[PDB]
Design a binder for this molecule. Structure first.
Ligand SMILES: Nc1nc(=O)c2nc(CNc3ccc(C(=O)N[C@@H](CCC(=O)O)C(=O)O)cc3)cnc2[nH]1
Ligand SMILES: Nc1nc(=O)c2nc(CNc3ccc(C(=O)N[C@@H](CCC(=O)O)C(=O)O)cc3)cnc2[nH]1
Lengths: 159, 159
């Protein structure tokens, strides 16, 4: 089963040049809870940002180029990614843009973070038709002393 | 000697209801690095938003109220706080606004991060007269893949 996970600002904006101007430790927690013990697939850019492997999870890196770091698994194609995951009950795709795109249609589940933030980004989440998905969980949280903005958690299942 | 350290947004705005809309690890790194193995004065609100002692530093509290946490020292005045600190070369006042206020007149050096961000805040960093201060160091940095905003590090000494 394939599930995408992402943080969306206003207008399906997921990224820009510089780091997103926002502090949401709570988001990282959910991210963490939701992906631990699951293999995670990502792109070269994404991986470059993180800088290290995520622990408690299997990192598969979808890339055309040869990777040196041996602590992660390098792959060249979508099939391979999957193949590299084994017989698990859920594969989590973590981005960025291009991967979300490619894996989007094979996805069956969406964990999404909708952050009330208006920014001018380069990369956007993919467009999916609401029609086709079913909200199974939703939860709003206001900004606070530790989170710079309010946000809402959501889990969409493919209809 | 007393020193203050703080991050200023546009117009000395330093705090608000909900936390600061920005991601600046470099700054967080500068904070830590300039505080590590020293004394730290802070007020209840700051303490509350931090939520745990700052490791590698004696955490002092400046409150009127009594306190339950035994992992920190609580003081009730400026003179206590200072005593509490001991025979060290440099004490560091970390916030918030009021505390900054009180300590300002005693301070001999400031550690400021000037962030390039417009935020509508409640709290400001006190107004100090620039002429009574001498800039010892300043270093500007542009936003990047980590820090969501440009900022400049500055350190002034009392003339
Ligand atoms: N909702 C959501 N928020 C994100 O920030 C996120 N980030 C990506 C891609 N980038 C990242 C970047 C850093 C970390 C990260 O450090 N995750 C840690 C938590 C570390 C911590 O608790 O500080 C992990 O171990 O899960 C994760 C994803 C994909 N989906 C996400 N999904
Ligand atoms: N320059 C400056 N930047 C700040 O962010 C700042 N914040 C405070 C008060 N609030 C805080 C809140 C959290 C941490 C904090 O977590 N510091 C850690 C670094 C952890 C990390 O790198 O994530 C520490 O170990 O001191 C410090 C001060 C006071 N002076 C400041 N001064």
């Amino acid at each position: 089963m394939i599930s995408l996970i992402a943080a969306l600002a206003v207008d399906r904006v997921i990224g820009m040049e510089n780091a997103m101007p926002w502090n949401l430790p709570a988001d990282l927690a959910w991210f963490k809870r939701n992906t631990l013990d699951k293999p995670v697939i990502m792109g070269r850019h994404t991986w470059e940002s993180i800088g290290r492997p995520l622990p408690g999870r299997k990192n598969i890196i979808l890339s055309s180029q040869p990777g040196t770091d041996d602590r992660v698994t390098w792959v060249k194609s979508v099939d391979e990614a999957i193949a590299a995951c084994g017989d698990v009950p859920e594969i989590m795709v973590i981005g960025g843009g291009r991967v979300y795109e490619q894996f989007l249609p094979k996805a069956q589940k969406l964990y999404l973070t909708h952050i009330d933030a208006e920014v001018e980004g380069d990369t956007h989440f993919p467009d999916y038709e609401p029609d086709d998905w079913e909200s199974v969980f939703s939860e709003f949280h206001d900004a606070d002393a530790q989170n710079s903005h309010s946000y809402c958690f959501e889990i969409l299942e493919r209809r």
